[PDB]
Design a protein around this ligand. Structure first.
Ligand SMILES: *[C@@H]1O[C@H](CO)[C@@H](O[C@@H]2O[C@H](CO)[C@@H](O)[C@H](O)[C@H]2NC(C)=O)[C@H](O)[C@H]1NC(C)=O
Ligand SMILES: *[C@@H]1O[C@H](CO)[C@@H](O)[C@H](O)[C@H]1NC(C)=O
Ligand SMILES: *[C@@H]1O[C@H](CO)[C@@H](O)[C@H](O)[C@H]1NC(C)=O
Ligand SMILES: *[C@@H]1O[C@H](CO)[C@@H](O)[C@H](O)[C@H]1NC(C)=O
Ligand SMILES: *[C@@H]1O[C@H](CO)[C@@H](O)[C@H](O)[C@H]1NC(C)=O
Ligand SMILES: *[C@@H]1O[C@H](CO)[C@@H](O)[C@H](O)[C@H]1NC(C)=O
Ligand SMILES: *[C@@H]1O[C@H](CO)[C@@H](O)[C@H](O)[C@H]1NC(C)=O
Ligand SMILES: *[C@@H]1O[C@H](CO)[C@@H](O)[C@H](O)[C@H]1NC(C)=O
Lengths: 99, 369, 216, 99, 49, 50, 49, 39, 49
């Protein structure tokens, strides 16, 4: 609406600082994930032999059957949390259907 | 958008894009009747404030510019709607009232007002919408011997609810002795006659009041003005005017099984998610046109002058509202950056696993994982 | 002529058993828990079982009418303040065959709403509100089994007609082996559950017990 | 067991649902739909109603941004604790009691 | 005659809720921690005392 | 006052989110006290010899 | 609204009203009899299920 | 924390299921089904 | 010695004191008492106040 935008233009610069705050939070989330997880410099690989003195490590090491290289316990934790897709894969394309 | 003339290397959100409407369609029901507002605003004698009439007005092509040529009033006082805007919008049911009051109690015909007329004669609802028309009538309703043809009530046991009438004539019990239809001590008639004369002041002169009340509800509209309809279009970004639903969206055929009485289709999304045509009887969908954010990917102006544009939430099959390398990311779709089958460190982060960098090998802006 | 044909009525108070939910608006909704404030009869209330085998009934803010008779003795209804001539005269008389709603008052050839279309083991349910001039009438034809009393379940009441009088209604009379239920409406807040379609399948009375207050 | 991550999803779902639901309020105006005000009234009175709606929606958006900033601070504190636990529990051996 | 601040605070719609753990239970927890520290060292923080 | 409540109902759901914030703070205080003080699984006691 | 009780406040003869923080009319003087009445609000609280 | 209606007080001591107030908790227990309150 | 817990008490006391004291303000209206606004005026003007 053009008239609402013209009347909103008189209220100053609230929206630029709201956008600045939201962009700062969005950068901070990626900084959090990068600080927690990327603590290693090289991607180490486990050897093809799987003997570690009798310790199994089979439910925490990945298996190549899944298209996403995740362990068993990681699959349980990802199935446990009822996490929405949150409009990720082209939400306007998803909303254009006849439902 | 940065209020600066040198920009550093990164990704910046500049503005948003939208798809403009193409056409404008008006859908009004097929009515041809002209209804006599002249029969209300011009009559020999009007009703009283305790016996005001009510005229039902429905299925009418209403032109509200002819009222100014029928009565000489000061102001076309309308509360919830503009007087001059009445041609465009339209409602379902129209009512007309008429009564004659004096000059002292003209202001009491208003929502949330207290007085003799507002309590015992005629009460308006608090959420009233419509138009109230009042003008002086000392040249018609005054006599040199006294105009006693108009009656108003002053004694009652309770206050009137909004939009009510009372024509009962019983002697009020102001004391303990029963009147039994005989006036006397503590026995006064409820109908006090008006004493209208043309020799009085400006405050005691009679006034003619005609009230139009508009019934805005969810029923299908019957009274709409002389505005031409337009043929239907589908699967396009178009401005629609279905009943009073002025809005922008894309019209598709719907599957929502409407009940035979239902007209609107507001889901938890609200904002009239579905709508019914008044011309034909077919359900239709409402969805807004394509929009999203624009992010500009560039290195610094000290280095180069090339940019890349990212549209978020769009797969570039609907993109228009270098310039030839189109890449489909997951965070949207990428314009102006080539894709390579390599892997480096992240220089400018775009989205889910995709980064961008300014590459020496002819210079270009490259995108990778 | 005038007569007195089986005018002896007998009362026996029974339970409402969560019956009498209608659609409060003209808007279509799907899979939404929506809260509306309107005149509904409360859940588990005290409705009656007037058996006549009839002076008046006190109308107040709506009447939940029901009738389980398969002999179709229930034909029409009479509303108004005083059911005679002179002041506050009104008739909302209905009938069988072609259902006409003649509002021609006793006192005088007044206005009419003579509109034709037909209104009609089975339990008919009706709600007669009188709000803002419109005389809203709701109905739902529902099969019934498992002996007497009002059954357990949820039957949404679709609107049937609408009728703009703008009048004073105080009394109520049923025109006629006879067994009809009369319940009254009061302003209550409900929470209504819509399924994938628009059909209401579950409701919560937000003022019955504290558990329903927690749910609302 | 996984209530923290579920709360992380649920808080933003509830916040976005409340921010969407705040668009249907009137804030003292005559209609919650802008085009109804543009089609019903003249310029000045509809400008007054538009100003009422602008003030209400600005207050709602500022409330959402402030709550997001506080929740981002809490999330960053938990992410710093998680990064410390990754550096000390996983990449070494810890002598700190109950860490 | 001397109206309290807490009376006006309660009367104007502001209510202070009591804590879940009373001060006697807090003193009991502190006493248990002191008795474990005195009579068992650090062994009560890693298993049985 | 009933008129003030009817006018306050036009402003949306500010009261519900204020109540939610205060309820979260009130639960968080008990969580803080529980995670500070309730660190021992059993209630030990000192023998009577001192 | 509230509960009227007999008061022991020392109203000097030029005074008629009573007040505390947040404009709370604690006391009042009757126009017919020379008596002080305390005003305190009626009982209220919160309901939890 | 006020007074409680609908839950019976017992002279026992369990873990806190539903927190009420200053050292009082409530729970649903099998031993005729009923809602009890305790310290 | 114990100034931190004293500050914890004092801050949450004076916040409620300020919240109570903020009911005396007019905020541009004609009176800070709601009943006087309701009694003194008609529907629309009292609605504005
Ligand atoms: C390591 O643990 C896995 C379980 O995750 C063991 O695999 C199971 O072994 C039993 C006994 O032979 C089988 O019945 C199951 O079908 C196996 N589950 C699988 C393969 O998913 C595995 O044996 C353990 N490693 C060793 C060396 O014992
Ligand atoms: C209006 O149009 C509809 C369909 O376009 C038609 O069925 C109807 O008879 C028309 N009404 C009149 C009065 O012409
Ligand atoms: C008012 O109506 C009457 C009857 O229709 C008509 O004769 C008269 O001329 C009208 N008044 C004016 C001023 O035209
Ligand atoms: C829109 O994007 C999705 C996401 O990859 C894609 O599958 C789909 O094919 C795109 N639409 C068209 C018309 O190509
Ligand atoms: C209905 O009211 C009567 C009044 O005597 C009472 O006896 C009866 O139990 C009530 N029915 C209910 C509450 O279901
Ligand atoms: C409606 O009827 C009642 C009962 O007879 C009566 O007291 C009241 O005055 C009537 N109201 C109107 C507007 O006729
Ligand atoms: C909705 O209607 C369809 C058919 O129109 C039916 O198959 C489906 O079961 C219905 N869903 C309900 C009643 O929840
Ligand atoms: C008014 O009332 C007071 C106390 O009731 C009394 O002392 C006084 O004389 C009365 N005045 C009149 C004029 O009646």
């Amino acid at each position: 609406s053009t008239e609402c935008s013209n009347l909103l233009l008189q209220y100053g610069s609230f929206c630029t600082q709201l956008k600045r705050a939201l962009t700062g939070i969005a950068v901070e989330q990626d900084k959090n994930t990068q600080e927690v997880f990327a603590q290693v410099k090289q991607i180490y690989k486990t050897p093809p032999i799987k003997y570690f003195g009798g310790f199994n490590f089979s439910q925490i090491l990945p298996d190549p059957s899944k298209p996403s290289k995740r362990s068993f316990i990681e699959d349980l934790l990802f199935n446990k949390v009822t996490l929405a897709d949150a409009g990720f894969i082209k939400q306007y394309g998803d909303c254009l259907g006849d439902i | 958008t940065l209020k600066s003339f040198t920009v550093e290397k990164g990704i910046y959100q500049t503005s948003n894009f939208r798809v403009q409407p193409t056409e404008s369609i008006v859908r009004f029901p097929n009515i041809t009747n002209l209804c006599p507002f002249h029969e209300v605003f011009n009559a020999t004698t009007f009703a009283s404030v305790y016996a005001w009439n009510r005229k039902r007005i429905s299925n009418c092509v209403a032109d509200y510019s002819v009222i100014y040529n029928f009565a000489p009033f000061f102001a076309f006082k309308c509360y919830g709607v503009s007087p001059t805007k009445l041609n465009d919008l339209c409602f379902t049911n129209v009512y007309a009232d008429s009564f004659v009051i004096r000059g002292n109690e003209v202001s009491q015909i208003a929502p949330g007002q207290t007085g003799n007329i507002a309590d015992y004669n005629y009460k308006l609802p608090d959420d009233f919408t419509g138009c109230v028309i009042a003008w002086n009538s000392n040249k018609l309703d005054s006599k040199p011997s006294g105009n006693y043809n108009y009656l108003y009530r002053l004694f009652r046991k309770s206050k009137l609810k909004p939009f009510e009438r009372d024509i009962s004539t019983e002697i009020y019990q102001a004391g303990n002795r029963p009147c039994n239809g005989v006036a006397g001590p503590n026995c006064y008639s409820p109908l006090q006659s008006y004493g209208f004369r043309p020799t009085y002041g400006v405050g005691h002169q009679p006034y003619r009041v005609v009230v139009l009340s508009f019934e805005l509800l969810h029923a299908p509209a019957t009274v709409c003005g002389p505005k031409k309809s337009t043929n239907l279009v589908k699967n396009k970004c178009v401005n629609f005017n279905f009943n009073g639903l002025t809005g922008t969206g894309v019209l598709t055929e719907s599957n929502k099984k409407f009940l035979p009485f239902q007209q609107f289709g507001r889901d938890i999304a609200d904002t009239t998610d579905a709508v019914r045509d008044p011309q034909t009887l077919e359900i239709l969908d409402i969805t807004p046109c394509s929009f999203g954010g624009v992010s500009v990917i560039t290195p610094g102006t000290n280095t180069s002058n090339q940019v890349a544009v990212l549209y978020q939430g769009v797969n570039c099959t609907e993109v228009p509202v270098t310039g030839s390398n189109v890449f489909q990311t997951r965070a949207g779709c990428l314009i102006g950056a080539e894709y390579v089958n390599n892997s480096y460190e992240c220089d400018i982060p775009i989205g889910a696993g995709i980064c961008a960098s300014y590459q020496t090998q002819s210079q270009s802006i490259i995108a990778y994982t | 002529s005038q007569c007195v044909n089986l005018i002896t009525r007998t009362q026996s108070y029974t339970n409402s058993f969560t019956r009498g939910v209608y659609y409060p608006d003209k808007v279509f909704r799907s899979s939404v828990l929506h809260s509306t404030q309107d005149l509904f009869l409360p859940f588990f209330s005290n409705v009656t079982w007037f058996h006549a085998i009839n002076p008046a009934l006190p109308f107040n803010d709506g009447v939940y009418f029901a009738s389980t008779e398969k002999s179709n003795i229930i034909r029409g209804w009479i509303f108004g303040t005083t059911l005679d001539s002179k002041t506050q005269s009104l008739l909302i008389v209905n009938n069988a065959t072609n259902v006409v709603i003649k509002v021609c008052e006793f006192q005088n050839c007044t206005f009419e709403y003579v509109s034709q279309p037909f209104l009609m083991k089975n339990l008919r349910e009706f709600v007669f509100k009188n709000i803002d001039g419109y005389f809203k009438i709701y109905s739902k034809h529902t099969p019934i089994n498992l002996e007497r009393d009002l059954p357990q379940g949820f039957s949404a009441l679709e609107p049937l007609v609408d009728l703009p009088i703008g009048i004073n209604i105080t009394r109520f009379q049923t025109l006629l082996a006879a067994a009809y239920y009369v319940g009254y409406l009061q302003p209550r807040t409900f929470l209504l559950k819509y399924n994938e379609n628009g059909t209401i399948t579950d409701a919560v009375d937000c003022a019955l017990d504290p558990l329903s207050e927690t749910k609302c | 067991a996984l209530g923290k991550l579920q709360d992380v999803v649920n808080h933003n779902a509830q916040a976005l649902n409340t921010l969407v639901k705040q668009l249907s309020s009137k804030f003292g105006a005559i209609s919650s739909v802008l085009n109804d005000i543009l089609s019903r009234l003249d310029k000045v009175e509809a400008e007054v109603q538009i100003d009422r709606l602008i003030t209400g929606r600005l207050q709602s958006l500022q409330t959402y941004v402030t709550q997001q900033l506080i929740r981002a601070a809490e999330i960053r504190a938990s992410a710093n604790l998680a990064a410390t636990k990754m550096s000390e529990c996983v990449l070494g051996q810890s002598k700190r009691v109950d860490f | 005659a001397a109206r309290d601040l807490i009376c006006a605070q309660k009367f104007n719609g502001l209510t202070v809720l009591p804590p879940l753990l009373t001060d006697e239970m807090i003193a009991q927890y502190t006493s248990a921690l002191l008795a474990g520290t005195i009579t068992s060292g650090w062994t009560f923080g890693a298993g049985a005392a």
